[PDB]
Copies of this chain bind each other. A is one copy, B any other.
């Protein structure tokens, strides 16, 4: 199950790093293996809180609702985590997810801890008024015990909670408890743009997974082992599951020349070797129901996991790949777009077959990065780039004028050259400048710089295509370094 796999991953990663850590990372009496209790400190969750609060139903009825919150690590003061509305949430689930969140944050180098929430409520049972009342009471109860403050803990949306729920979170801390706090509105991430949101929030995960895939494809050394090399172009990719992540990943990946051979979903699959236009399929999906039946698309009989392709993106529920299904696959690269779609056993088969598996701890951190950017914007009290767009535009025009004049007063006998016309792509960028470009640039830079680090760690620790342990080792090293010089 999912609760034990994270602990197993941590245990596997904590034994590989200890030998190198004890020797060349301390400055006595060989009593440093006893200092490896720092790993034991990191391993368990710090705080867990259980709640039971009453609400008033529409028909004059009283009910009790129970919720949970867990904070794993507090080496970084702002804890980060999501809120889940479901009727099957448990303490162990939030424990495991909070434990995963701190490593996820540490991988992409954001200064956040780890958290997770959960309310034993079925969303499709209550009126919007009742949901709002539940949200308000939960916010108040969490804030009274020190679990909501902008400098303490910051909730984030999930699959079962939209931005509407977290619009209510903001104007309950800022109206009751954080009235005197100047940064009261910064205690939540994922709020709408009108309330202090960030542009480009929706397409964060798709751009993140696209950049993560792109970074590894353009690596000659790694691609040489798989025997495909070049880069993009003529590559064939298939996606299973057509959520937000899958849709945006397919769009951004097809924009750069990749061909989408097939698309999977809960209903019947879609198969077309000629390629599928993401825009047309998205329009069909939004028009009516699912993609069951699509023009210029022959339905695929049988599972698409074994279909012939180059990149496979399993952006769906967990445990999509098992030991039995492992030998039958044919894709040379698996890009884990969801939370743990591969069983630990199947990793052994993939390693034995010389198949690269991009870890899920790395690929889908674009949402966390954009949430961090939103938190920074809320702290700054100003949208990004508002005070610099015109300045850069004027500087670029001046530089072009200088180049044109320098060229003119060199051949100034016959010629009216005008090297001051920006290209159409540059003109469109200049005219359409906004904070969305800044957010996307920051995301791309972050996910390139954090890919270089994981590649270096994998090379250093003398391990092959097993990138998951490399990511876990990198995160554990960072956390141990944080604890080491703190006392």
Q: Does A184 lie at the interface of the complex (its beta carbon under 8 Å from any beta carbon of B)?
A: yes
Q: Which residue of B lies closest to A426 (CB)?
A: B398
Query: A406 near B420 (CB under 8 angstroms)?
Result: yes
Within 8 Å CB of A367, what residues of B?
none
- Given A145-B145, A146-B144, A37-B49 contact (CB < 8 Å): no
For A194, A403, A410, which residue has the most chain B Cβ atoms within 10 angstroms? Answer: A403
Q: Of B168, B421, B444, which is within 8 A of A487 by CB?
A: B168
Contact B387 A195, beta carbon cutoff 8 Å:
no
Asked if A399 contacts B399 (CB within 8 A), the reply is: yes
Instruction: Enumerate chain B residues within 8 angstroms of A420, measured Cβ to Cβ.
Output: 406
Indicate if A379 sits at the interface (CB-CB under 8 A): yes
Give the residue name and chain of the B residue nearest to A150 (CB).
Answer: B182
A67 to chain B, nearest CB (A): 11
Interface size in chain A (residues, C-beta < 8 A): 107
Q: Which residues of B contact A132 (CB under 8 A)?
A: 487
A419 contacts which of B181, B403, B485 (Cβ < 8 Å)?
Answer: B403
Decide if A229 is an interface residue (CB 8 Å cutoff): no
Alpha-carbon separation in the docked complex, A37 to B417 (Å): 63
Kindly state whether residue A60 has any CB partner on chain B within 8 Å.
yes
Please, what's the 1-or-0 string for A358-398, where 1 marks a CB less than 8 Å from any CB in chain B?
00000000000000010010010110101111111011101
Is A220 interfacial (CB-CB < 8 Å)? Answer: no
* Residues 257-278 of A at the B interface (beta carbon under 8 Å): none
Q: 1/0 contact trace for A39-58 toward B, CB 8 Å?
A: 01100111111111110100
| Shortest distance between the CB of A53 and any CB in chain B (Å) | 7
Closest to A170 in B: B486
A423 near B441: Cβ-Cβ < 8 Å = no
A149-177, CB under 8 A of B: which get 1 and which 0? 01100000000000010011001001111
**Other-chain residue from B49, B151, B391, B407 in contact with A47 (beta carbon distance below 8 A):** B49
**Bound Cα distance from A390 to B419, whole angstroms:** 25
Name A126-141 residues within 8 Å CB distance of B.
Answer: 132, 140-141
| CA distance in complex: A64, B61 (Å) | 29
Given contacts A44-B64, A77-B182, A390-B448, 13 further A-B contacts (CB under 8 A): A37-B62, A46-B52, A47-B52, A140-B175, A144-B146, A151-B181, A164-B485, A176-B177, A387-B438, A387-B439, A406-B417, A407-B419, A410-B417
